[PDB]
Design a protein around this ligand. Structure first.
Ligand SMILES: Nc1ncnc2c1ncn2[C@@H]1O[C@H](COP(=O)(O)OP(=O)(O)OP(=O)(O)O)[C@@H](O)[C@H]1O
Ligand SMILES: Nc1ncnc2c1ncn2[C@@H]1O[C@H](COP(=O)(O)OP(=O)(O)O)[C@@H](O)[C@H]1O
Ligand SMILES: Nc1ncnc2c1ncn2[C@@H]1O[C@H](COP(=O)(O)OP(=O)(O)O)[C@@H](O)[C@H]1O
Ligand SMILES: [Mg+2]
Ligand SMILES: [Mg+2]
Ligand SMILES: [Mg+2]
Ligand SMILES: [Zn+2]
Lengths: 49, 407, 49, 49, 49, 706
């Protein structure tokens, strides 16, 4: 997703003023409307999710 | 870890401590605060500790010499020659542990009354049974426990009853009922408060004597240190733990800091010491009677004031002392003569001049036995207790003169 | 100073030094000594609750 | 323990109530566990988000 | 209930005056400070809250 | 059969291993019951119902049906338990073939293992054996994720090294990777690894179970994957597990003696205890709510172990139920909490009251004004002593955010404790600005405090505020101020003495209540109070209340007294809402208002000096005697006259006499003064007889025995 964002940002800022020639990495922060789960619920089945 | 007994100490010296190793069956035989005899061998254990200087060291006797590029110098040279420091420390390896002064000559071992009686010899229980049947045993115990003290009979009686103690109980709701009495002696100078406390310390097993401003909270209750060998924590018992099921004798109680008075108060409340320190938490257990001696404010007890106005003990502390004994120096020529006579007789006839009807060992056996009894309260005792309480409260009413402290 | 502003001890009901009372743009004194028909105040509390 | 990154850094201060979204993950620094007095536990790695 | 003048003064505090810095570098504060002295039942803690 | 050479090696062999497998399968299928029920059938049904992966096998019946396995199991519990787990797994798959997608592993726990060794008696004789101990959990880590079936990345070719089983006693380390044959570095692949829950608890001996001169020993246990969070610090548990030695605990590092550290691989944890569900239990709650005397029953059912103090009990019941918090708009915040302050001279059960409230309520934490408690009033941030974790130790006030903060020795707080309590009682939140933390974490507790008066005895000639070491800002934050008052009444002294001596008699370790209403058991009572799920509201009288406050103002500013204020009617509203909640009403009714008025006025009137207290007792007596029947009013008058007489007697007779008496006439006169005029039921009353009173109509005398 972040590589995709880098590409899309490239093709919407194209062309860029000189000095801004190298395309930047885009960090994709992500949010949701789901209700948070308990910190006590962080068992082992949630590892890497 | 054991340490040198007090009678062995030379002048100007701190008591030496050595660590003894207990093995397979001797392994739980010595408890903190126990006077014990250890039979075994003194051994050396290689300990890793230097930088006093390079010292004695071991190395191979084989005459090797590193080649160019591999010169046996430096750390490579020390490693190649097998060089190690010969540093040692002395450790006792005990095959057997016994109490230094056994209570019953028969055999140690759940501690029921029958277990204690079986633990004795035949003559020992002859004596225990004899003194149990002794009419006038109360007076005899008071006189044989405090021979060198003149007068102060009430203080002797109260300290004796403290030594015997009441019955602990647990309520169905979980409330714990204190079953051992605390006594505080308040008095003018030189009325022998410290002497009562010293008598009880030297008589009682599991008795600890501490003073006012010489003890920190950790040394009074509990301290935690880490086990040098394992991942666990070893708990250092303080004064109120070594006095568990015994007596803590706090002399100069009025001079104790509040940071320490709170710890005494907590132990006197719920008979425990909960410690959370240095990685471990643990609820220790302190079923200790307290024998305290306090000086009055300004040194001299003022009979025209309440007990609260005379001692700087906090109300939380005072409220949970069973008996307060005021030892006022009255300047009576007759009592001056009597006290002087007893003191001079003590100093003239040292080993004699005490004729106590029961030896301290006999009383210790007798007390270890009698502490296993849990008397009930009969119905008539209920009724009489209620009547006595009504009278005691009637003492507290108006009209009549003020008492030193309320009922 | 005492707990209730009493007019018998005016100017003695404040224990602030003169250099603090200078720092305050407005100083309000509030009393409660006497009014029978401040009873609408009772009704107001009941209404609000 | 939380691990923030490029623009998640300094987005919050101590005392903030936050809702965190992230990967429940373990530290991967090379299966070299030789701790001292404590840690009787084997196969255990430090968790973070 | 009541306390209308005090409420107006509170509104003035809430907006505040103008903070000046004179050319010599000295500053005049713009913030208003109020003191409420009164009997202990009047809603003046309520008003601070 | 059996009897090879070594039990562990005996059951490691293929023959006996497979034979044990089939024997345990047979036991699982065919151990029916004492009455033909096939307990394992519906046990597996309950397990697979809520995805529980844990099968508890009793030891008693396993020793009954198949004693050879029951002999083998303690000696070689690792292997026998592995066998049991796999046999149970395939039995379950037979019963629920779909269930194999869930956890692919059944944990056989073992209960009632016969011989229980205590923590201090564990030896190396017990190593690698299944033991039962018992103790108290002192510490407990968080649930950690432990590698279970761990896959690695060869970070030379990125091949994922196949799943390796992580044992409890050795760090799994791969050799080469099978593709590129690098011995080189590997890393856990954390996306394809599976983990299991891991928890390390410490269990010491129960302090009661420790001998006279001896310290409690402690052990570490390991909870795995279904056992985690079954224990909490302070729990007394029965722990069954393998007394385990051989993982990495051996002091080989020249630190000293070559000793082995030991752990228990927990197999089974039994918590020895009895918190709220309120399911289907609501109909009986409403049933006794219909009593129309439930209020007195509830007032009578709190602190059953404390004699007397009926008014403190009623106030504490109101505090337990509490009022209605409201915030008109978002700019005017009124609490619903009812805060109680007990100030009374010593030995009057205030500490006992606080202890009871802590027992009966959820979210109650007990703290003391001295330094004698686990939790203090003030927030701080520190490395925790035992967990070593940098934690924000939010104080006692916020730990009871929707509960009760019980503060004993309230008069003995520090300056900073007083500031904390003032902020919590005033704004209902705590403001930290300590380390780098700037936060306002909130504390909406009811504060019940116990204080001793200045000088150790309450002085009725002074106001409440001037014989307690508290400032007015603190005293004003309490809805109920209970002035506890230790006076020598022979009748109540006898009653209390009988009460406490009876308590001491019935709790003697060998062999291990006076109101018109039956007490209510604390269990349905906790549940009843927990029926605060329904809020409550009031649309009732305002002219009576307004007139009452106006009259109170005129009196309390005529007399030079503590003036009634608004907060007194707001507290009266809280107490009315609480009283309505006690009856589950959902509307304040005139009796709720009247009782709240009586309580608010009792609290406000007892806190005046003696002259003002008498005057207000007189002028407001009609408000003050609501639901206060004739029998108790008359008993109070009679006690007053008899005490007057006793003081008169003992002032110049040295002591009070026997058969203390008083005429009929003056009692009649005072009963008229309060408009009784009918004393006959008073003389026939149970309450008259109970107080050691007697009516002597021969001479119009009434007298006490003592
Ligand atoms: N109705 C009662 N009134 C007074 N005391 C009672 C009553 N019932 C029982 N008691 C006993 O009185 C003892 C007093 O202890 P408690 O700690 O309750 O007093 P306290 O009010 O905290 O005193 P202090 O102010 O000195 O701390 C308790 O052990 C309790 O068992
Ligand atoms: N009956 C007695 N009354 C007072 N003092 C006594 C009595 N018998 C002995 N003494 C002596 O008085 C001395 C002072 O006692 P001590 O307890 O040290 O003083 P304090 O009571 O101030 O602590 C002791 O050496 C003790 O032997
Ligand atoms: N008009 C009013 N005058 C006085 N008190 C009021 C008024 N309206 C409401 N109150 C209430 O009086 C109660 C006590 O007031 P408080 O805020 O404690 O004032 P203070 O801190 O000055 O005593 C508060 O609950 C407040 O909401
Ligand atoms: Mg002395
Ligand atoms: Mg205020
Ligand atoms: Mg108390
Ligand atoms: Zn590879």
């Amino acid at each position: 997703l972040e590589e995709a964002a880098k590409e899309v940002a490239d093709e919407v800022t194209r062309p860029r003023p000189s000095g801004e020639e190298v395309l930047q990495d885009i960090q994709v922060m992500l949010k949701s409307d789901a209700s948070p789960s308990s910190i006590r619920s962080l068992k082992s089945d949630m590892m890497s999710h | 870890r054991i340490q040198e007994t007090q009678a062995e100490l030379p002048r100007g010296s701190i008591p030496r401590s050595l660590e003894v190793i207990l093995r397979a069956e001797a392994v739980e035989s010595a408890q903190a605060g126990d006077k014990c005899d250890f039979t075994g061998t003194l051994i050396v254990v290689p300990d890793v500790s230097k930088l006093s200087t390079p010292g004695a060291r071991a190395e191979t006797n084989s005459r090797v010499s590193g080649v160019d590029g591999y010169e046996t110098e430096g750390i490579r040279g020390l490693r190649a020659l097998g060089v190690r420091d010969l540093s040692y420390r002395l450790v006792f390896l005990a095959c057997c542990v016994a109490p230094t002064n056994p209570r019953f000559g028969g055999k140690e071992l759940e501690q029921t009354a029958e277990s204690i009686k079986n633990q004795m010899t035949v003559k020992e229980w002859e004596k225990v049974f004899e003194m149990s049947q002794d009419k006038n045993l109360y007076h005899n115990l008071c006189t044989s426990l405090f021979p060198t003290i003149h007068g102060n009979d009430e203080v002797k009686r109260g300290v004796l009853l403290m030594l015997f103690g009441g019955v602990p109980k647990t309520t169905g709701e979980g409330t714990s009922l204190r079953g051992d009495i605390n006594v505080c002696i308040v008095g003018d100078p030189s009325t022998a408060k410290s002497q009562f406390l010293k008598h009880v310390e030297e008589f009682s097993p599991r008795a600890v004597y501490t003073s006012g401003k010489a003890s920190s909270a950790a040394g009074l209750t509990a301290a935690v240190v880490r086990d040098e060998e394992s991942h666990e924590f070893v708990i250092e018992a303080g004064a109120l733990m070594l006095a568990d099921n015994g007596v803590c004798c706090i002399d100069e109680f009025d001079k104790m800091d509040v940071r320490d008075q709170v710890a005494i108060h907590e132990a006197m409340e719920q008979q425990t010491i909960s410690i959370t320190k240095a990685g471990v938490k643990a609820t220790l257990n302190a079923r200790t009677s307290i024998l305290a001696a306090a000086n009055p404010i300004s040194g001299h007890y003022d009979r025209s004031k309440s007990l609260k106005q005379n001692i700087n003990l906090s109300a939380p502390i005072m409220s949970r002392f069973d008996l307060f004994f005021i030892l006022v120096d009255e300047c009576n020529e007759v009592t001056d003569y009597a006290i002087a006579r007893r003191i001079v007789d003590l100093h003239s006839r040292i080993e004699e001049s005490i004729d106590r009807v029961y030896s301290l060992d006999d009383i210790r056996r007798y007390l270890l036995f009698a502490r296993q009894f849990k008397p009930k309260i009969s119905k008539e005792s209920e009724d009489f207790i209620v009547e006595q309480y009504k009278h005691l409260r009637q003492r507290d009413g108006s009209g009549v003169t003020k008492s030193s402290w309320r009922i | 100073v005492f707990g209730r502003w009493d007019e018998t001890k005016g100017e003695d009901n404040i224990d602030f030094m003169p250099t603090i009372l200078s720092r305050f743009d407005m100083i309000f004194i509030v009393k409660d000594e006497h009014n029978e028909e401040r009873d609408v105040m009772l009704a107001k509390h009941v209404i609000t609750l | 323990q939380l691990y923030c990154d490029r623009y998640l850094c300094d987005k919050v201060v101590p005392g903030n109530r936050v809702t965190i979204m992230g990967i429940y993950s373990i530290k991967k620094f090379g299966l070299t566990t030789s701790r001292g007095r404590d840690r009787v536990g084997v196969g255990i790695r430090s968790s973070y988000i | 209930f009541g306390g209308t003048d005090m409420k107006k003064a509170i509104a003035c505090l809430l907006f505040g005056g103008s903070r000046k810095r004179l050319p010599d570098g000295l500053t005049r504060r713009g913030d208003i400070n109020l003191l409420m002295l009164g009997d202990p039942g009047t809603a003046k803690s309520q008003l601070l809250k | 059969d059996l009897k090879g050479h070594s039990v562990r090696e005996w059951v490691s062999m293929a023959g006996p291993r497979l034979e044990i497998h089939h024997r345990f399968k047979n036991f699982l299928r065919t151990h029916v019951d004492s009455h033909g029920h096939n307990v394992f059938k519906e046990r597996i049904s309950d397990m697979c119902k809520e995805n529980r992966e844990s099968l508890v096998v009793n030891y008693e019946d396993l020793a009954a049906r198949e004693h050879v396995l029951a002999y083998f199991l303690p000696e070689a519990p690792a292997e026998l338990l592995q066998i049991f787990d796999e046999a149970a797994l395939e039995v379950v798959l037979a019963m629920y073939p779909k269930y194999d997608r869930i956890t692919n592993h059944i944990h056989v726990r073992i209960s009632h293992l016969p011989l229980v060794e205590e923590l201090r008696s564990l030896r190396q004789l017990h190593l690698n054996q299944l033991i039962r101990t018992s103790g108290v959990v002192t510490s407990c880590t968080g649930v950690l994720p432990q590698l279970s079936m761990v896959k690695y990345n060869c970070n030379k070719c990125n091949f994922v090294l196949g799943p390796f089983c992580q044992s409890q006693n050795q760090e799994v380390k791969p050799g080469s990777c099978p593709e590129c044959q690098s011995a080189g570095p590997f890393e856990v692949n954390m996306e394809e690894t599976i983990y299991q829950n891991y928890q390390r608890i410490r269990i010491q001996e129960s302090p009661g179970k420790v001998a006279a001169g001896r310290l409690p020993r402690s052990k570490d246990a390991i909870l795995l994957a279904d056992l985690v969070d079954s224990c909490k610090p302070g729990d007394e548990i029965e722990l069954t597990g393998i007394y385990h030695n051989n993982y990495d605990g051996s002091l080989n590092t020249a630190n000293g003696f070559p000793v082995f550290a030991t752990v228990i691989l927990a197999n089974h944890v039994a918590k020895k205890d009895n918190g709220e569900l309120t399911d289907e239990d609501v109909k009986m709650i409403t049933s006794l709510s219909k009593d129309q005397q439930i209020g007195e029953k509830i007032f009578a059912s709190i602190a059953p172990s404390i004699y007397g103090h009926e008014d403190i009990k009623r106030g504490l019941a109101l505090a337990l139920f509490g009022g209605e918090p409201k915030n008109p708009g978002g700019k005017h915040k009124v609490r619903g909490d009812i805060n109680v302050l007990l100030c009374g001279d010593p030995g009057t059960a205030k500490s006992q009251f606080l202890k009871y409230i802590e027992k009966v309520s959820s979210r109650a934490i007990f703290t003391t004004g001295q330094g004698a408690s686990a939790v203090g009033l003030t927030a701080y941030v520190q490395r925790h002593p035992v967990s070593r974790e940098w934690t924000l130790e939010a104080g006692a006030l916020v730990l009871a955010d929707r509960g009760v903060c019980l503060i004993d020795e309230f008069d003995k707080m520090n300056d900073q404790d007083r500031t904390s309590i003032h902020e919590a009682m005033e704004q209902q939140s705590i403001s930290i600005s300590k380390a780098g933390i700037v936060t306002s974490l909130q504390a909406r507790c009811t504060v019940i405090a116990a204080a001793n008066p200045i000088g150790g005895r309450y002085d009725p000639s002074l106001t409440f505020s001037e014989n307690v070491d508290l400032t007015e800002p603190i005293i004003s934050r309490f809805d109920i101020l209970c002035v506890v008052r230790d006076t020598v009444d022979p009748v109540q002294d006898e009653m209390l003495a009988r009460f406490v001596v009876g308590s001491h008699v019935r709790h003697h370790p060998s062999n291990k209540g006076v109101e018109p209403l039956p007490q209510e058991v604390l269990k349905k009572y906790i549940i009843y109070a927990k029926e605060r799920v329904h809020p409550k509201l009031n649309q009732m009288d305002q002219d009576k209340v307004a007139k009452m406050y106006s009259d109170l103002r005129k009196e309390s500013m005529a007399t030079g007294s503590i003036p009634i204020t608004v907060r007194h009617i707001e507290s009266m509203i809280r107490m009315a809402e609480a009283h309505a909640r006690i009856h589950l009403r959902d509307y304040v009714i005139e009796d709720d208002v009247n009782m709240a008025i009586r309580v608010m006025l009792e609290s406000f009137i007892d806190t005046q000096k003696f002259s003002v207290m008498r005057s207000m007792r007189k002028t407001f007596a009609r408000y003050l005697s609501f639901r206060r029947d004739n029998n108790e009013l008359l008993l109070f008058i009679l006690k007053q006259l008899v005490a007057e007489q006793v003081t008169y007697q003992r002032n110049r007779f040295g002591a009070q006499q026997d058969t203390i008496e008083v005429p009929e006439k003056d009692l009649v006169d005072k009963a008229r003064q309060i408009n009784i005029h009918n004393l006959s039921a008073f003389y026939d009353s149970e309450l008259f007889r109970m107080n050691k009173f007697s009516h002597d109509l021969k001479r119009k005398m009434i007298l006490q025995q003592f």
